[PDB]
Design a protein around this ligand. Structure first.
Ligand code: HEM
Length: 152
């Protein structure tokens, strides 16, 4: 649960991402895959990537980065009223992709890392607090659907 001031910060920060959604999305996924290599195993179409250079050079990875952040941004722009948007993602990730909620924690922190990396000194304490809360909300609502489905 976020305040309007906090949502304001979230969507302010998101404007940064939208100026270069492919660049951000790429770096988020790279941070995830290199930080937590077991995550790479969940992607049949990325499991071939051994090195970060190959990751950096992958246009399909950038493409998927765009799809992921486009989806996330759509959800964030709802300011918490995202049930319709989130349910199919929760379902596909639990039932088709089999993604444990732990990996959603991983990518949440990765987004935080990337924002600091791409905007050093431009991602303030208040901004981090708001973004972190937004991602926690996202995660928590997914976790509820996972419980429903009995998915671990
Ligand atoms: C902010 C978090 C995330 C968002 C918004 C997101 C969104 C999406 C979307 C929109 C798709 C394509 C449609 C679909 O299959 O539902 C997708 C596919 C997929 N996602 Fe996620 N995702 C997130 C996190 C993750 C994480 C953390 C993992 C694994 C570590 C993951 C694994 C996958 C896989 C394996 C696919 C299918 C890829 C393919 O073969 O095309 N996702 N995701």
């Amino acid at each position: 649960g976020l305040s309007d001031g906090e949502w304001q910060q979230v969507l302010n920060v998101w404007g940064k991402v939208e100026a270069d959604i492919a660049g951000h999305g790429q770096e988020v996924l790279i941070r995830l895959f290199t930080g937590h290599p077991e995550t790479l195993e969940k992607f049949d179409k990325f499991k071939h990537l051994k090195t970060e250079a190959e990751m950096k050079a992958s246009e399909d990875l950038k493409k998927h980065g765009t799809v992921v952040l486009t989806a996330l941004g759509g959800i964030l722009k709802k300011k918490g009223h995202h049930e319709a948007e989130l349910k199919p993602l929760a379902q596909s990730h639990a039932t088709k992709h089999k993604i444990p909620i732990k990996y959603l924690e991983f990518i949440s922190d990765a987004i935080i890392h990337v924002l600091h990396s791409k905007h050093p000194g431009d991602f303030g304490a208040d901004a981090q607090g708001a973004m972190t809360k937004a991602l926690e909300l996202f995660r928590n609502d997914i976790a509820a659907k996972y419980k429903e489905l009995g998915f671990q």
